[PDB]
Amino acid sequence: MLEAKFEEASLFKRIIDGFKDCVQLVNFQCKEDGIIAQAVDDSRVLLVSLEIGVEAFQEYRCDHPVTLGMDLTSLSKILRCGNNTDTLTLIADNTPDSIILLFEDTKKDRIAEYSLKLMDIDADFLKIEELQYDSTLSLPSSEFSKIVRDLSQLSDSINIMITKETIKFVADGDIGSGSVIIKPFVDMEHPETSIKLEMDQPVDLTFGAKYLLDIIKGSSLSDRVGIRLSSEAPALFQFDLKSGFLQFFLAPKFND
Amino acid sequence: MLEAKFEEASLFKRIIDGFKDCVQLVNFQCKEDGIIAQAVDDSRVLLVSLEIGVEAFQEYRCDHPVTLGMDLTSLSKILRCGNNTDTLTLIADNTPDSIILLFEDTKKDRIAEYSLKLMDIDADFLKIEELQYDSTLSLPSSEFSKIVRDLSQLSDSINIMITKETIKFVADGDIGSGSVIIKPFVDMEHPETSIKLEMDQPVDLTFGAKYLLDIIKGSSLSDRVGIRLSSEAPALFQFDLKSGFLQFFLAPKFND
Amino acid sequence: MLEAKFEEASLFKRIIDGFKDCVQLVNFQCKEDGIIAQAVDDSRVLLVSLEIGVEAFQEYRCDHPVTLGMDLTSLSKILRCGNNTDTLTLIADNTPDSIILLFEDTKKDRIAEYSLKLMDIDADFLKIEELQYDSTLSLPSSEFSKIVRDLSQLSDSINIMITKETIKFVADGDIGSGSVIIKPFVDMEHPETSIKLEMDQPVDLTFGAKYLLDIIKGSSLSDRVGIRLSSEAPALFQFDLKSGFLQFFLAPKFND
């Protein structure tokens, strides 16, 4: 058997919401210490890696590793059936016939049970994560979402430029151009609004605006967002969960 | 002459809102003791029966029976002209040239007058209502709306199953299946949230999901919804008004 | 150089919002005493005239007249980048290479800079404004917006009729007809809700409903709206700003 209970069903919906767009199908590997999942879009420029620890649940029981894959559209449509305050339980037994989703409310009444059919996918798992990245920065997700949403209307490509103590987001298209310059600072009212930055080597990268808009969806999961950049590898966008995280690996556009 | 004044225009809009979809044209018969109306959709699987007593109005005057029919789209577009707190007056004189709608506000000012042209329809009135139904249940409209809206995403058909002290809503489609089981209970905080059920004979019926979504619109008219079921006749969905009601007769899908 | 700073960026967005529809391109002439702009739609039945005084800004500096034209769509898309509480600064230097837009927040941080390319337009400026109009009236913008939005669903033409101490809005179409009659009154709670009217000669005009719906957009700029009517010339719809205004000249439909 396999039982995983989210305290609030909102968490699982938001997590799948990061998966909802920019990818069709996903493979969830469950084991004794939690669940992990990798998914790559059709153009293979974006990889989404999810890890959810035991502490993110209120109840977790896995007597046996278990791999279950499912269509995100089919899964998202079934994740439109519960209150965001409901308790959500996932059920599977050994060889997975199919996955069971179970909703429950505060008033011990109105029990909804669902069954999503499972699929067969290729286990080509990627460990492209790097030891050291050329530059690293963190900032409020709301601020970063604004920056991307603003510049997206100008062009299909967004450029990120980092120098010493300076972060510069630049977009340039048909109707014109725009730029947002932010600098590291520590705000003591709430140390959350702080912008942090560590630079080993200056970086200059360009990303497809289409894919960045898909990445910023993780703002519903965390107050802050982590960005690890390097001119040698895809960028790493990370959203922290309670004892877990959701990662977005995006390959820069290149070259002249 | 004929004068019928709704205290709040919201009531008439919501009543027509139950008519807005799942039917094109409607025939309103007015007389000394109120108004009644029947309408059947194109496929003749759904019949909508409305009855509005004198007490639902604040003022009603009818010196003569009078039948007036009108296009719901044309009527709904004209019901988008007033505040939901306005006083609405319907005016007609003997042989109906056309119907007059009159809006009025708290501040005795801003008087809006409208004139909707009338049509000729066939008076084939149906009295298919049954003496005794095999089973009867009532429950909060909000709860019932959730159950239908949830299961609708799974398939085009929804199955309702009733056994002794047990009500089971089941849907089964391509992407998977789902089920909601509710049981009778009396909640004394508000006796409104109570689920009631009386069974003479167990029933198992299947309905087109398209039509149920049209029926649940009556939730804006009442706190509770009444469902009378039988394996021999169309189901009866009833929403109570202040001294009136709105009914939905739906024929089950059948058979193997 | 040329620097014009709006206290709140919301003002400029709403002003362009009156321009957003019912016209494609606009020519902004800036000089020592403020900015003015004229724009005519494709069918040449509607002229939009804008005037913004120095006092509408918090800061204004113009060492030299300067004419700059720009696409409204391109401009509106770039006006979707700031909070409605931001400070907006427009920058240009002598012969305009292109216009610069600059956003700033309360927390002296997050500086966004943009550059919209400019165009070449024909300076055929119109002074069709009349000395004396046959009739003049003013009323709450919210009330006038309701009247237009209501009657618009009935037909493609709206008729305005003015007699002694009487204002009558009438629409007549396929599905039926409607009419709204308002009369002059002074309400002392707030003298804003007052309806004023001065008649030299009674007027009866008909306007394209398509264009009136575009005109009522100025409601986001002022509490009241001014309407100057005449059977000899296009109607004048005026929305007052803080030391400025936005005007709509609309030619009546004519004739039998």
What's the DSSP call for residue C253? P
Q: Look at strands B111-117 and B135-140 and give their pairing.
A: unpaired
Q: Name the β-bridge partners of B167.
A: B162, B182
Q: Does residue A83 belong to the interface with chain C, where contact is any CB pair within 8 Å? A: no
Q: What is the resolution of this structure in A?
A: 3.0
C109 and A180 in contact by Cβ < 8 A? no
Size of interface A-C (CB pairs under 8 A): 43
Q: Does residue C118 belong to the interface with chain A, where contact is any CB pair within 8 Å? A: no
The C-alpha atoms of residue A216 and residue A150 are separated, in whole angstroms, by 12
* CA C170 and chain centroid, separation: 23
Q: Where are the alpha helices (DSSP H) in chain C?
A: 9-20, 72-78, 141-151, 209-215
Question: Under 8 Å CB-to-CB from A24, ≥6 apart: which residues?
Answer: A41, A42, A71, A72, A73
A192 CB neighbour count, 10 Å cutoff: 9
Question: Could you tell me which of C74, C67, C158 has the C-alpha nearest to residue C121?
Answer: C67
C115 and A177 in contact by Cβ < 8 A? yes
Question: Under 8 Å CB-to-CB from A255, ≥6 apart: which residues?
Answer: none
The C-alpha atoms of residue A164 and residue C155 are separated, in whole angstroms, by 64
Q: Does residue B108 belong to the interface with chain C, where contact is any CB pair within 8 Å? A: no
What's the DSSP call for residue A55? G
Q: Name the β-bridge partners of A252.
A: none
The C-alpha atoms of residue B82 and residue B102 are separated, in whole angstroms, by 10
The C-alpha atoms of residue B38 and residue B121 are separated, in whole angstroms, by 11
Chain A residues touching B153 at Cβ < 8 A? 77-78, 80-81
B175 and A117 in contact by Cβ < 8 A? yes
C143 and B110 in contact by Cβ < 8 A? yes
The C-alpha atoms of residue C221 and residue C242 are separated, in whole angstroms, by 10
Q: Look at strands B224-229 and B235-241 and give their pairing.
A: antiparallel
Q: Does residue C93 belong to the interface with chain B, where contact is any CB pair within 8 Å? A: no
Please name the residue of chain B whose CA is at the shortest distance from the CA of residue C182.
Answer: B110
Contact C25, C71 (CB under 8 A): yes
C111 and A181 in contact by Cβ < 8 A? yes
- Among partner residues C74, C110, C112, which is closest to A175 by beta-carbon distance? C74
What's the DSSP call for residue B187? -
The C-alpha atoms of residue B221 and residue B246 are separated, in whole angstroms, by 9
Residue that has been written with the tokens 């084991």 in this structure: A31
What residue type is assigned to position C86 of the chain? Answer: D
Please name the residue of chain A whose CA is at the shortest distance from the CA of residue B153.
Answer: A77
Residue that has been written with the tokens 């997590």 in this structure: A15
The C-alpha atoms of residue C62 and residue A196 are separated, in whole angstroms, by 40
* Residue to test with chain C: of B83, B114, B117, B119, most C Cβ within 10 A: B114
Contact A68, A117 (CB under 8 A): no
- Among partner residues B77, B98, B115, which is closest to C153 by beta-carbon distance? B77
The C-alpha atoms of residue C124 and residue C121 are separated, in whole angstroms, by 9
* Residue to test with chain A: of B150, B167, B174, most A Cβ within 10 A: B150
Contact B85, B13 (CB under 8 A): no
Question: Could you tell me which of B202, B216, B147 has the C-alpha nearest to residue B179?
Answer: B147
Question: Could you tell me which of B77, B79, B72 has the C-alpha nearest to residue B23?
Answer: B72
Please name the residue of chain B whose CA is at the shortest distance from the CA of residue C174.
Answer: B117
Residue B27, preceding bond cis, omega within 30 degrees? no
Question: Could you tell me which of C28, C172, C13 has the C-alpha nearest to residue C84?
Answer: C13
Both tokens of B243, joined, read 């001294």
- C77 burial type by CB count under 10 A (0-12 exposed, 13-18 middle, 19+ buried): middle
Q: Where are the alpha helices (DSSP H) in C3-105?
A: 9-20, 72-78
Please name the residue of chain C whose CA is at the shortest distance from the CA of residue A167.
Answer: C110
Question: Under 8 Å CB-to-CB from A90, ≥6 apart: which residues?
Answer: A2, A3, A4, A5, A99, A100, A101, A102
- Among partner residues A110, A112, A114, which is closest to B176 by beta-carbon distance? A114
B113 and C153 in contact by Cβ < 8 A? no
The C-alpha atoms of residue C154 and residue C149 are separated, in whole angstroms, by 10
The C-alpha atoms of residue B89 and residue B57 are separated, in whole angstroms, by 10
Question: Under 8 Å CB-to-CB from C43, ≥6 apart: which residues?
Answer: none
Contact B33, B91 (CB under 8 A): no
The C-alpha atoms of residue A101 and residue B125 are separated, in whole angstroms, by 47
B176 and A113 in contact by Cβ < 8 A? no
A7 CB neighbour count, 10 Å cutoff: 15
* Residue to test with chain A: of B167, B175, B195, most A Cβ within 10 A: B175
- C107 burial type by CB count under 10 A (0-12 exposed, 13-18 middle, 19+ buried): exposed
The C-alpha atoms of residue C246 and residue C256 are separated, in whole angstroms, by 32
The C-alpha atoms of residue C97 and residue A171 are separated, in whole angstroms, by 19
Q: Look at strands B59-62 and B66-71 and give their pairing.
A: unpaired
Contact A223, A31 (CB under 8 A): no
Contact A37, A126 (CB under 8 A): no
Both tokens of C225, joined, read 């709206």
- The domains found in chain A, sorted by start residue, are 1-256 (3.70.10.10)
* Coil, strand or helix at B190: coil
What residue type is assigned to position B158 of the chain? Answer: I
A114 and B178 in contact by Cβ < 8 A? yes
Q: Look at strands A59-62 and A46-52 and give their pairing.
A: unpaired
Contact C113, C81 (CB under 8 A): no
Q: Look at strands B2-6 and B59-62 and give their pairing.
A: antiparallel
B109 and C182 in contact by Cβ < 8 A? yes
Q: Does residue A106 belong to the interface with chain B, where contact is any CB pair within 8 Å? A: no
Q: Name the β-bridge partners of C101.
A: C90, C114
With residue B9 as reference, give the H or E element that holds it.
Answer: helix B9-20
Q: Name the β-bridge partners of B69.
A: B27, B119
The C-alpha atoms of residue B149 and residue B142 are separated, in whole angstroms, by 10
What residue type is assigned to position B69 of the chain? Answer: G
Beta-carbon-side half-sphere exposure of residue C248 (alpha carbons within 13 Å):
26
The C-alpha atoms of residue B29 and residue B36 are separated, in whole angstroms, by 5
Chain C residues touching A185 at Cβ < 8 A? 109
Residue C83, preceding bond cis, omega within 30 degrees? no
Contact A12, A75 (CB under 8 A): no
Phi and psi at C145, nearest 5°, equal -65, -40
What's the DSSP call for residue B86? S
What's the DSSP call for residue A80? T
The C-alpha atoms of residue C38 and residue C26 are separated, in whole angstroms, by 6
Q: Does residue C156 belong to the interface with chain B, where contact is any CB pair within 8 Å? A: no
Q: Does residue C43 belong to the interface with chain B, where contact is any CB pair within 8 Å? A: no
Rg (CA), chain A: 20
Q: Does residue B142 belong to the interface with chain A, where contact is any CB pair within 8 Å? A: no
- Among partner residues C154, C179, C182, which is closest to B113 by beta-carbon distance? C179
Residue that has been written with the tokens 């799948």 in this structure: A16
The C-alpha atoms of residue A28 and residue B222 are separated, in whole angstroms, by 44
The C-alpha atoms of residue A102 and residue A88 are separated, in whole angstroms, by 6
C183 CB neighbour count, 10 Å cutoff: 12
Experimental method: X-ray
**DSSP notation for A169-219:** EEEE-SSEEEEEEE--B--SS-TTS-BEEEESS-EEEEEEHHHHHHHGGGG
Q: Does residue B243 belong to the interface with chain C, where contact is any CB pair within 8 Å? A: no
- Among partner residues C111, C112, C117, which is closest to A175 by beta-carbon distance? C117
